[PDB]
Amino acid sequence: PWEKDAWEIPRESLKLEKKLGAGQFGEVWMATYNKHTKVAVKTMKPGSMSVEAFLAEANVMKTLQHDKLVKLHAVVTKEPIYIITEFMAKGSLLDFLKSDEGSKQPLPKLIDFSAQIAEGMAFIEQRNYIHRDLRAANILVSASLVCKIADFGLARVIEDNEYTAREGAKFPIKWTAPEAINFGSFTIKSDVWSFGILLMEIVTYGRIPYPGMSNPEVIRALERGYRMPRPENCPEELYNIMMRCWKNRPEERPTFEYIQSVLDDFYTAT
Amino acid sequence: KPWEKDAWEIPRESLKLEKKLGAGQFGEVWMATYNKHTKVAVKTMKPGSMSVEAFLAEANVMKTLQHDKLVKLHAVVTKEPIYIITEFMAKGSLLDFLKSDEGSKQPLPKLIDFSAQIAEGMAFIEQRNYIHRDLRAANILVSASLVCKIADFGLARVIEDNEYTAREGAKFPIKWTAPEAINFGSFTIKSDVWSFGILLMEIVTYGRIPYPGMSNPEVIRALERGYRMPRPENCPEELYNIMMRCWKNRPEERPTFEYIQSVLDDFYTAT
Ligand SMILES: CN1CCN([C@H]2CC[C@H](n3cc(-c4ccc(Oc5ccccc5)cc4)c4c(N)ncnc43)CC2)CC1
Ligand SMILES: CN1CCN([C@H]2CC[C@H](n3cc(-c4ccc(Oc5ccccc5)cc4)c4c(N)ncnc43)CC2)CC1
């Protein structure tokens, strides 16, 4: 139980133990808080995030408490910002699906992963929040194989400046619904499109979306009604959900409440 | 057979509009036949979009801007509303071509070829102390043999701002326009250079929107803080370096089109 009164904490309360990896806009560490609590710490790169803007958003994030969302524990306000969360022992779902243990998960387990993520996104949907960067790399997996959504809303507070431009694409074209690419219209419905791509990621154990296709080829193909074909070992029930998520009109995409209910039914059937 | 060089102001009756090519904000464009034998394009301006006297004054400058990489301005019709008669370009706009089945398959050397052709045309405009004012892939035309020609050069200056054109939305697009042109109406050959950089990104991405995922306010504030579009997939560093030169904050620090044309010509043969 993280101490409820510990929100803005000093940097010295954290002992960074092990570097888990380096991303575009920050690094993540396994750490010990106050000599006793194992946590994860995301240290943002200098210039990636404003303290005032992040804190204003992080005070919304921290209220998004749900079993399928990574728990946001604390922050460090000194530059550059630290984000302190629960530690997830099996890392990202993308890495897990491409590991020895995760590549062997049977189809019912894959459906269960998808249903867990859908339940978390249904919570975000009910709370009138938006993830903005849903993909398997932003799903974390616990020691007992519970999937939790990470980085919810974080893309909104990563600044676009000379420092972050050096790091490349902020959002990946292949996961992003057409209207957010073309019009910056990020909504829960653009999250629904991304969830469809994530579902394909899960069923393919982490294959790149649209294999063999460049980003321009993906955009133009989607405009002509192309959608990723159903791959091997993908049940039609699962593929049909993906196709619903990839409707061209955002308003015609299903709710996450609908998605979770259908995924839950297909889990028990499998 | 080439256009006759004393047929400038022509009667509307000399034109047979054959097929509408598309409807724009301030006018429409038609494939037409002139005098029963000459295939042309006709841009018919919407009523209220242009003054006949102001247009004629500018059109008499535009018609002297004759160059292989600029669309040839043949004739005009002065009765309201104005018609602009030019050569016909069989593959339409470069933006549409890059998003078509055939144009989406153009190899990288061809994309560099297109860039160098446009740069050659802009170097001519630069040498003639003219200003395009609305350079983007939508305003480049492509011929049957894949020659790229610059269209609408100078036309934005004679589109009126009134109750009629205000209903058509934004006159110039924010994400294509140099900051000093947005902020102070400072349209120069150097703001064209900025726009050419955005056009070069359009070409290498086969027509993607500039600044994907970003609103217009987000683009303006990001640029003020040194953000520039990152190098995309399958964009050589040579080409991206030219874009970055075009996007210098200070206009006088942007290269000339004579420089851009020479560097793109070098990179073309290398590819
Ligand atoms: C080749 N791989 C190497 C490992 N790389 C990544 C390294 C960091 C890993 N990682 C990332 C996280 C992690 C930590 C904090 C965080 O911040 C927010 C959370 C919610 C809302 C807003 C912000 C988001 C994510 C993580 C973790 N908590 N517990 C355990 N591991 C974690 C996820 C994998 C991925 C590529
Ligand atoms: C979805 N698409 C549908 C097609 N839309 C456009 C429709 C009009 C097309 N189009 C436009 C032109 C065209 C014609 C006249 C003209 O006027 C000036 C030229 C130079 C200087 C000043 C004025 C400018 C451009 C065109 C063409 N010449 N020959 C062949 N096609 C042409 C270019 C594409 C673009 C959007």
From Swiss-Prot, chain A:
UniProt keyword Membrane, yes or no: yes
Modification(s) after translation: Phosphorylated on several tyrosine residues. Autophosphorylated. Becomes rapidly phosphorylated upon activation of the immunoglobulin receptors FCGR1A and FCGR2A. Phosphorylation by the BCR-ABL fusion protein mediates activation of HCK. Phosphorylation at Tyr-163 increases kinase activity.
GO cellular component: caveola; cell projection; cytoplasmic side of plasma membrane; cytoskeleton; cytosol; focal adhesion; Golgi apparatus; intracellular membrane-bounded organelle
Residue positions of the active site: D133 (proton acceptor)
Effect of E57A: Loss of kinase activity
Residues the entry annotates as binding ATP: L20, G21, A22, G23, Q24, F25, G26, E27, V28, K42
GO molecular function, one term: lipid binding
Listed transmembrane segments: none
Regulation: Subject to autoinhibition, mediated by intramolecular interactions involving the SH2 and SH3 domains. Kinase activity is also regulated by phosphorylation at regulatory tyrosine residues. Phosphorylation at Tyr-163 is required for optimal activity. Inhibited by PP1 and A-770041.
Protein's cellular compartments: Cytoplasmic vesicle, Secretory vesicle; Cytoplasm, Cytosol
Reported tissue expression: Detected in monocytes and neutrophils (at protein level). Expressed predominantly in cells of the myeloid and B-lymphoid lineages. Highly expressed in granulocytes. Detected in tonsil.
Modified residues (Phosphotyrosine): Y163
Keywords attached to this entry: ATP-binding, Cell junction, Cell membrane, Cell projection, Cytoplasm, Cytoplasmic vesicle, Cytoskeleton, Exocytosis, Golgi apparatus, Host-virus interaction, Immunity, Inflammatory response, Innate immunity, Kinase, Lipoprotein, Lysosome, Membrane, Myristate, Nucleotide-binding, Nucleus, Palmitate, Phagocytosis, Phosphoprotein, Proto-oncogene, SH2 domain, SH3 domain, Transferase, Tyrosine-protein kinase, Ubl conjugation
EC number(s) stated in the UniProt entry for this protein: 2.7.10.2
Annotated signal sequence range: none
Induction and repression of expression: Up-regulated during myeloid cell differentiation. The highest levels are detected in fully differentiated phagocytes. Up-regulated by IL2.
Broad class of the protein's primary localization: cytoplasm
PTM sites of type Phosphoserine: S214
Illness the protein is tied to: Aberrant activation of HCK by HIV-1 protein Nef enhances HIV-1 replication and contributes to HIV-1 pathogenicity. Aberrant activation of HCK, e.g. by the BCR-ABL fusion protein, promotes cancer cell proliferation.
Family recorded in the similarity comment: Belongs to the protein kinase superfamily. Tyr protein kinase family. SRC subfamily.
Name of protein: Tyrosine-protein kinase HCK
Curated annotation (Swiss-Prot), chain B:
Activity regulation, short description: Subject to autoinhibition, mediated by intramolecular interactions involving the SH2 and SH3 domains. Kinase activity is also regulated by phosphorylation at regulatory tyrosine residues. Phosphorylation at Tyr-164 is required for optimal activity. Inhibited by PP1 and A-770041.
Gene: HCK
GO biological process: cell adhesion; cell differentiation; cell surface receptor protein tyrosine kinase signaling pathway; cytokine-mediated signaling pathway; defense response to Gram-positive bacterium; Fc-gamma receptor signaling pathway involved in phagocytosis; inflammatory response; innate immune response-activating signaling pathway
Phosphotyrosine: modified positions: Y164
Protein name: Tyrosine-protein kinase HCK
Source species of the chain: Homo sapiens (Human)
Domain Protein kinase: 15-268
EC id: 2.7.10.2
Modification type Phosphoserine: residues: S215
Outcome of substituting D152G: In an ovarian mucinous carcinoma sample; somatic mutation
Disulfide bonds: none
UniProt keyword annotation of Transcription regulation present: no
